[PDB]
Design a protein around this nucleic acid. Structure first.
Lengths: 64, 51, 145
RNA sequence: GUAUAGUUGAAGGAUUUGGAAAAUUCCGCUAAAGAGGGUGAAAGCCCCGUAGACGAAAUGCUGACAACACCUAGGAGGAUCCUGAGUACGGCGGAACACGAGAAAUUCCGUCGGAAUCCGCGGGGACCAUCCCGCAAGGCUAAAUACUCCCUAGUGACCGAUAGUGAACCAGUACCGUGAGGGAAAGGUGAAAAGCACCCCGGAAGGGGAGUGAAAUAGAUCCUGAAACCGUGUGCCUACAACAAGUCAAAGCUCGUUAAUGAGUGAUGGCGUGCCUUUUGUAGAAUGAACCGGCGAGUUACGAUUGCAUGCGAGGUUAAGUCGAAGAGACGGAGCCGCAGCGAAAGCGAGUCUGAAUAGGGCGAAUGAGUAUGUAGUCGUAGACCCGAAACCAUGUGAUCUA
RNA sequence: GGUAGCGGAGAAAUUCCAAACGAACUUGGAGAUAGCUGGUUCUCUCCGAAAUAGCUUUAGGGCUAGCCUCGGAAUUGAGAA
RNA sequence: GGUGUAGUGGUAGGAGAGCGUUCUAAGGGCGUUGAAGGUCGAUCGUGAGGACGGCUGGAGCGCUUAGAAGUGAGAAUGCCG
RNA sequence: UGAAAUUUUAGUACCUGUGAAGAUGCAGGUUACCCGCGACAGGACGGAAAGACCCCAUGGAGCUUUACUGUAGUUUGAUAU
């Protein structure tokens, strides 16, 4: 039978055109009065793939 | 060629001879043999399918 | 070449049979080493498991939605047109009909990369704001039908 | 027309080795038949057959076309009448829909409420309006689809007696348990039984002659007949000796090979704590093997990814399905992958997002090649390298023992 | 003759229910499950480690990072002493 | 392809090339003047292994090229004899 | 007449040492012709039973409770008959 892709990563990660993946940062949906104002600016913007976690995840997101 | 029923009913010979019509010519029927006899019209009906 | 045969060079490997004596290199535990659950029968954890550490997908947040009525097109840029020399009515038929646009998706859009020197005529369903200028520079005619 | 008995069906002799030829050597003949089996060894021409041709009293089956049954009419009008009731639908509580009450449409079930009648009623994923498509609450219906206890005719890069059915042999038998239940081992003389008349020892069993036979060291536990294990005879050595049992050196004694820098045996001297598994560590007094023989563990299907090879190459490629020998072998362009990205999205496009910004930044583009099949390495779903529990759930069987 | 396993019976001991009862026996789900034991069969050549950090209802398990190996690419001079 | 220089201990493991078993296909062969199997031999190759001869044995089997696997045994307080 | 448990191959000496840390087998010395028969039980960490004690399995089972979630039963209200 076919593989089944993960439905936790399809709702969190979208694939770019160069090969990598776009990722949305964390620590954004909670208390903010603890955090500073440089932090809450610099945690709006998306980051890329670290090549450690691209190994074990690659086969799950086989087509999406 | 086609129903040459008086020329196809005379090939239950020695194993020198195996006989294929103009449609069922495969690869193993040809590569195994050493020479091929063929009529004129069989060559034309080969050159229709094989363009 | 007859029945009594040669493959191409490098065309066909052999195999590697595992667990057949201690001088092939894979006898006594078969390339698995000592104990542990990577070395039992049918062991190994599921994919993406990292111990009880919360894995990467339960660490970063869910985001977005999908439109139900997304209508995206079947882009041809501009150089693909540059072999229909003069006067064709480029269209969602005869344009395709040689191996150009199989499976139009929602009608054909045209883009502007990168040089057209003909006098064609185009019938598509959308156009960029530079492909019209590139076509009318070369003296053609366009219509969004 | 077919199913259940059938008929007919071509062509060879001699020699050599043989116990016996189909084997060998010469010279022939046949084929709409050179597929297979049998005969004193391996057969186109010995036999049974095969290709072809022919054939049915009786019963059953399937076409056909006759008869007999059935069934089926137009155009216009629109005053009045009919068109499936405790039904539709709602509240409450559950189930079925990929949908777990969720913003929850559509389908049922239990209970309690409960409509309209063509100016009507339902549906288009809460709900309303507009538009569009449809008439529930009455029945019947062939084929394309899944299976094989059994019958006939076939095939296999399927097994060859610990294999293959548990069962090639009088096997669900012998045997075990009150019962439900569990369940084995065991194939082969030779071509022909021609299976040893007769004599001798012995109570017999058993044996030695004599015969049958090509062979009896093929004599019925009967083709071949390995290993552990038990014996007989002999070339060399051994009764002052501490030996993981070997190897290195070596006097004497005997022997004569796939001929060569020979074979057997070994007085005497040096050196030397077995084999596995598990461990920081083994000779271990950690853990396994009585010996010999047989059987006994990383595979296959469907996907994903990468290396190698092959054909095309800005393109590549079929699927289900029809004809075809369970086949190669053509039709079949629905579909899938690459050729353009960015954004959650409306959208824009070699550019786009955030932003007041023509600023900066992210991600793209600037020659930047994929695709189909084979093969190999790895992974996922399946029992997935095999062997091993204590326990869990659902049908059944037992109070002849004991309370 | 009667009483049956979620049960029966007990002048009470977790006692008996076909030599076994902290819940009988037989068949079926069932090749149950096991981060744990033991085993895994022919040979040669080339290279050849680790017993560490972080996190883990984790501490004899796993994950990435470090150390090994094979195939490419690119200027080099980036490596060393 | 003479000849130089350098290198060749090794567990888990990675890489490369070969030996051997049964079956299929095509070509070429052996066999009652003795095939497969068994026994003995003082033989050849770097390895797994391969020949030749003597005895037994009584109907089938090798060699070359490619292919497919129920493809190799010394240990499981293994199962059967 | 005729078994059984066990069993890596055994031509199986003593002392002081050495050694995963008390040896028939290692080292260095002492003692010792070859083969049996009846008795004793110091040793071969002797034989039988994959610890009767302890810890772990992110193991089971049986029992208790003001541990969590439920439920048979018992009760009360509306509604129907």
């Amino acid at each position: 039978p076919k593989q089944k892709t993960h439905r936790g990563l399809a709702k969190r990660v979208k694939r770019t055109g160069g090969g990598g993946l776009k990722r949305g940062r964390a620590f954004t949906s909670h208390r903010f009065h603890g955090k500073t104002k440089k932090q809450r600016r610099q945690l709006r913007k998306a980051s890329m793939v670290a090549k450690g976690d691209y190994k074990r995840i690659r086969q799950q997101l086989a087509r999406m | 060629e086609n129903g040459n029923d008086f020329a196809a009913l005379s090939a239950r010979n020695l194993p020198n001879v195996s006989v294929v019509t103009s449609d069922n010519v495969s690869v193993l029927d040809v590569v195994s043999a050493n020479k091929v006899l063929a009529t004129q019209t069989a060559l034309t009906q080969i050159e229709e399918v094989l363009a | 070449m007859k029945l009594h045969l040669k493959p191409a060079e490098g065309s066909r490997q052999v195999r590697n049979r595992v667990g057949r004596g201690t001088s092939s290199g894979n006898g006594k535990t078969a390339g698995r080493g000592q104990k542990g659950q990577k070395a039992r029968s049918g062991g190994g954890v599921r994919l993406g498991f990292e111990g009880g550490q919360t894995p990467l997908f339960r660490r970063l947040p869910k985001r977005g939605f999908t439109n139900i009525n997304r209508k995206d097109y079947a882009v041809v840029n501009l150089d693909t047109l540059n072999r229909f020399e003069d006067g064709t009515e480029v269209t969602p038929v005869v344009l395709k009909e040689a191996g150009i646009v199989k499976n139009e998706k929602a009608g054909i859009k045209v883009l502007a990369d990168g040089e057209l020197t003909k006098k064609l005529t185009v019938k598509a369903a959308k156009f960029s704001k530079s492909a019209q200028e590139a076509i009318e520079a070369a003296g053609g005619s366009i219509e969004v039908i």
